[PDB]
Design a protein around this ligand. Structure first.
Ligand code: CL
Ligand code: CL
Ligand code: K
Ligand code: NA
Ligand code: NA
Lengths: 250, 251, 251, 251, 251, 251
């Protein structure tokens, strides 16, 4: 019955934890890694499944791309009792030796977004819940993935805010010119688009959140991710996030 | 070349230089069928893409999802493929008493309560539509018989606190947005939505033509609940209007 | 009764609800004399005020001086006296190679490189004209036979560093404005001026209708000096155009 | 070189390195005639320019109009022509109850509620006068029999909302400025005016010496619109003061 | 090389790559003596520096003084001399009702209410500890039998207005900080202190590992000035914890 | 009755209403001993506090530590105990070629490159000294025989990146501060230090009188190293000057 997600509290069957990928197509994939996956609804960028993990209900809900739709999903799920949010995403590596297929667990986000400011002023840290970050690190490491813990630059755009130049105008606004090297020099691991919003919103709202993402491109090489390695990277990331969910449930 | 998110090529667009960009993927086919020879091109994520023909010219219809960030991707990727004019259509909630359900709003400028616009131009830059698009939208909206409002829209990266909604999980609105609705109301702002600041700033600073038209389906200031019929007519009218606005742009 | 800076009363305006607001006090009489029965009302500081009649309706002509701050005083004080529509007229320097001397620019939005706009609305708010005024100005400008550009203007609180001029006493431009002309050019900005951001933001947030039209008398990217006749023609056209825009605005 | 707005050459200034810069063009001749051999040089827009001699030294008197933007033009163009010291003589509103109409205030630093100052230095930079100028102004004020206050001035790009005036057309003051007058009062700020932030920042960051002395024509503890009755006397005192301050700078 | 402020050389540190950095110079010896072979190295200004050995590895203990600025000097100079890991042990005021005097807080991120953090990274950058350090601090805290909280710390450049204390000389708090404590409380912020924003931002953007654990010496829901009675024992627990955290980092 | 950090009471100050506030606790006794009957009051953290008598009036000497945050604490707590005038003394490095080692700088305004100033007044507020204090400091400095520079100081929350030092652990400086030294040099800024913005803004907005005077002990632009004797004389002169400035401030 929530405005956008089209699900009710009853639909969630007691779920207090959500796995929130960006891509609607990833929802079923994640759900099927758990028990009794059930399709709930799909409207706009929000595809929602429920499943069971060690006897506990878990909701899987896509967020779409971007802080704005992410913020809607988190809010509406929180309205229905969800308190823990595990983003599983795709990401571009900023550092040269973070490779495609590696997993990145965000310890803090550079807030290159707008939606985070709708929850807390810029000085507030876009930081994950410590339990979630711990669970994500553990799940990733236990899985045998190559895992990096660190800061993520989280941008409201895919193109200029991640300093991509292979674009229609080929221009990047002054603020973002040279930004990728600046973040690289500052030890920032990766770019994605939703963690600043997610982490700030949750950390300032009594919700627990984290972000783990599979590296699909190394930005020291090129701007557009290769298709060939997307599926395997995604499969690894969802294995990891489901295990992180297990760790959060008990 | 296939663009990364939209999954279409320039050839797929058959020479289209104009796109109608609703937020909701499900509305794409509904818009396309108002035109000739609608063809599904792709659906990935919150991007459903059709092509159609309007007065013999190819037009793209592509959903953006909610929010500037995903909108910015659709606009960019379509621009790479030759699209130069972008018409946003949707429905919206008004914050002015004189704006009724069923009315149309054509955005003359947006309050940039978003983040993505800043990735194209600093905050000082105006989130303003192309004048031809705004003009075509006004004319199309008027020709539909609806009352049309030209004015400023507050474009928020959130549905909840940025639109000063308190009926939420925390019930809190960050300091920045406390009292903001009344502020915008007093400044004559017509409505809230969530994509126009990004769309208009991006396009106006990138040599792209953009505008936004929206049917009003609710009013924050009115207790009355619009009936099903009026809402349905408003949704249908909004897309008839945007298609007619596209026709005016292609003339 | 008598407004403090302008030195006029509501009665002096003879029911005028529209003002034409050039920057230069010396231009006021010229504009007034394009209309019927021009009457000198007052001159104080940068504020020369005339009244005239256009199609039987009273119109105020009031100079603003250079800059948002003095403009904001004139607009406010005229608004206190019942003026609701403000038509900025002037001449301007373009920054786009395709914009030629003699062309007209009608502002669709302004880059807020000023301070006074912030005294009316936070930076996120668009410095946007009233749609009717912009439409009337476009129509008047097009009917003049001039080439007309609708687009964004960069509105600077300075003539020198904020317009990235280096031929100055210090030869320095603060970091904020270094490379800024090229940035605005690449963003499609048509010209620099010094009052529109304030005017448009103030009016758009205060229930007043405003717009700006300017004849192009120089182009920052061109080396040719326009001849005296061309400059005179352009000045004359700019004020003929604003008076015609006023005519179109009158009910 | 003939400077663009002021219409004077360096030779016209007869070696003047100091300018007295009132806001009101009508005040220029009044200042000039307190000195020797006053000559009218030019009048264009809000810029009326005289030269005179003080203890055998050339001094320029040049109005700035109201606002940082027009002020910044005058200062720049005078600086191009060799002027290095700028003494603003203005009118001001006191925001401390103990200050009386007719008192003089010499600004020791300005709250930068303007836009033009940012075109010279980022906001962190202090809008501070040259210490010699401030010292000369204080001494000149005391020696002229004036009651003088030294302190911080809030320097606003608007007369109305940025000085938290409510007796206005809309009666609204943007969020930023709501409660601002009491906040500045609580912080010990003495007065409001409109040009000192721009003048002082521009000069302090450009190797020019500047100061601002202003006659208190209103106390905001009582009212928002200055009484007419005391304007002339206050102005006459202020110009006596500023000429003597100029004398002290030339010694 | 002898670093400018700390007055120590790389050789003095005997290969230390980890520093414990309390704010209070008097706390340095107290920390060092929990380790093996503590040796005084230097004391200059707020910087008292000892070396000691923990499980055979050299560890530096260096006070920072109060504030990001002096902290930033200590961290930089220690980093020049090979230190890569920095463990702040401090005192803090809790702002959550459930947190008790004597509890420990391990900062998972800081609200950057400081200025020095901006000298290392723009405000968007998260003031976040190194994950290993935060992990080590939590475990150390738990293993000491103390009550520990993981969460966000508001890190202020002032003790008084930036922590919204009103029992002060002026009794005023600048607009920005009015209501700020409640705002942070509502956002789940655990405590106030003064150095973590600077420390964490500097380190996280400079390839250094940092964390902050602080003993709660006051709950701000109760009072503004910490009671003297519980200071010593709260300090004693905090330093036991930080030394054990160091042990875990060196393992 | 006993302030939290300084560990002194009002009675301890013996009616002192003026404090000399060096940064270095070790310098406190030296300053106190220039006056009569110096008495040690307290030492805690970076705060060493003495009292002495100057022309029969009690004067406090209190170190502040490095940086605005610790300074703000000392000023506040002394103000709680009746201190109203604060004279910052120290030595500094100049960034202008014309400023020589041994010269004195009296700050007329500070560039607010700090955070703590914002906890007292928004950025637009000028970090300006009290005019009487600045006057007294200028007079004392000039009477010493030193060359005295009245001008703007850049007040940084860091010693390293905020003063654009590259000889550091990371060897880089955040974008904001890249090229900043040359920018301040070109804007006429005399020197960097680390406390004046906080001190001056706090005091000027809190009804306290403050100023800063410093002896120049090095010049960023000169490769020549001053000898021990010159540095010693400059250090000595700086504190003699501040004591004489105190004398001038007293009644
Ligand atoms: Cl990517
Ligand atoms: Cl006033
Ligand atoms: K979306
Ligand atoms: Na003016
Ligand atoms: Na300190």
């Amino acid at each position: 019955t929530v405005f956008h997600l089209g699900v009710t509290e009853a639909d969630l069957n007691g779920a207090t934890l959500a796995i929130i990928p960006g891509d609607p197509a990833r929802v079923q994939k994640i759900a099927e890694l758990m028990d009794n996956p059930v399709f709930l609804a799909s409207h706009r960028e929000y595809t929602v499944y429920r499943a069971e993990l060690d006897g506990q209900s878990v909701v899987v809900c896509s967020t779409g791309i971007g802080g704005p739709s992410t913020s809607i999903a988190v809010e509406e799920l929180a309205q229905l009792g969800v308190r823990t949010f595990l983003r599983v995403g795709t990401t571009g590596a900023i550092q040269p030796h973070v490779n495609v297929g590696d997993m990145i667990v965000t310890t803090g986000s550079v807030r290159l977004d707008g939606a985070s400011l709708h929850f807390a002023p810029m000085e507030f840290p876009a930081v994950p819940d410590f339990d979630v970050a711990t669970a994500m690190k553990a799940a990733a490491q236990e899985s045998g993935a190559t895992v990096h813990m660190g800061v993520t630059a989280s941008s409201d755009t895919f193109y200029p805010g991640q300093e991509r130049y292979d674009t229609f105008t080929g221009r990047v606004v002054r603020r973002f010119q040279g930004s990728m090297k600046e973040w690289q020099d500052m030890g920032v691991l990766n770019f994605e688009m939703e963690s600043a919003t997610l982490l700030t919103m949750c950390a300032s709202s009594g919700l627990k959140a984290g972000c783990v993402a599979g590296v699909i491109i190394n930005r020291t090489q090129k701007e557009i991710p290769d298709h060939a390695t997307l599926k395997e990277t995604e499969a690894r990331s969802i294995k990891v996030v489901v295990e992180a969910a297990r760790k959060m449930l008990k």
